[PDB]
Amino acid sequence: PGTVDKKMVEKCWKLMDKVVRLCQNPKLALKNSPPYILDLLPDTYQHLRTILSRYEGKMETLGENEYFRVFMENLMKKTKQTISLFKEGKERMYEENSQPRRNLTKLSLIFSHMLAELKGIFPSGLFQGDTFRITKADAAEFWRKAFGEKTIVPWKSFRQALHEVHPISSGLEAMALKSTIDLTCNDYISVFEFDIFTRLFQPWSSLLRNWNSLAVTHPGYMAFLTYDEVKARLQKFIHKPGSYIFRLSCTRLGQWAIGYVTADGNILQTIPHNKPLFQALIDGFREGFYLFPDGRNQNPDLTGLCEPTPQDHIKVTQEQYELYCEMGSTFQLCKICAENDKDVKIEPCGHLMCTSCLTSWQESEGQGCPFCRCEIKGTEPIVVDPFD
């Protein structure tokens, strides 16, 4: 890549602006649901604006941040590519079915991904990339030991690392892995993209065997599909209840969105409340909801990754334990309800409580962790061994 200056940044502005204009064409009639580009691009500009104003004369050290640089070169290559998708598309742009239109749709998504990432890295406008919290303990542990505090790495550097930990069978399987995890399609892996992927493919314990089984060998997996496209694809199957497909949710990145055809002939989409994908699939199947992947009679057996190696029980240190005798309580108990033992761990913050309470707080409309108020990107079920 190369360094980022105000003069460049004003160019990205014009390019994004063109793309906007090319997408406001009354013949296009872009459907307004996410990802919706006339939302994405202006909101990106907005957040780009917030970022810039925060660095005052400090624009020196903003242009020299590796992540920001990779991002601009990628935002620039992605608009150039969209503007060039219009010149070479001509009127095939106004046919909802065209291969050219399908490529616009795939771009909308890449844009949502880029914007989610940007805000993951510069939440308030200030670069947080170095302190970014990886949601999964064991995934965070891998990134730290391997890459330290880096925000972004070359895909080659990423393959080499992961292979030492999670062996990649071949070159082909590596391309498949790349295409899946590189959401911004930039040939790097940000700490944000890493997070999404390991959220989607948990448990970290067997990460690839998970992703092999839910994506590589699964007919139900749809990559870079929109909400609307999922609607359209199931239509062909609307006469055949039990047919399902699943994709990434674009509005909640790191979460799965399962589309399905109900016994009455309607298409619903659902995002599993935090749980692992394979269990929602296995239960869904067992209960009769998810039967025919992409409409095919044959449905895969997921019980293989069923029981991962169990996350070790937490054990209380004497020094911690003695305090709770004083405090007039016991370490393993939910401090929200003072009733149930803590059965659940919130990630990334780390806080323990009971699932029964975490559910009630979420259903009550409550934002984030009930303690620190930070975002809840994950849950790891757990059991405590009291120090006694």
């Binding site: 649901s33 619903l268 989409q269 659902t270 409340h273 869904g284 909801f289």
Partner: peptide
């Protein structure tokens, strides 16, 4: 009302 619905049970 974002288009997603509660999981089937």
């Amino acid at each position: 009302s974002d288009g997603y619905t509660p999981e089937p049970a």
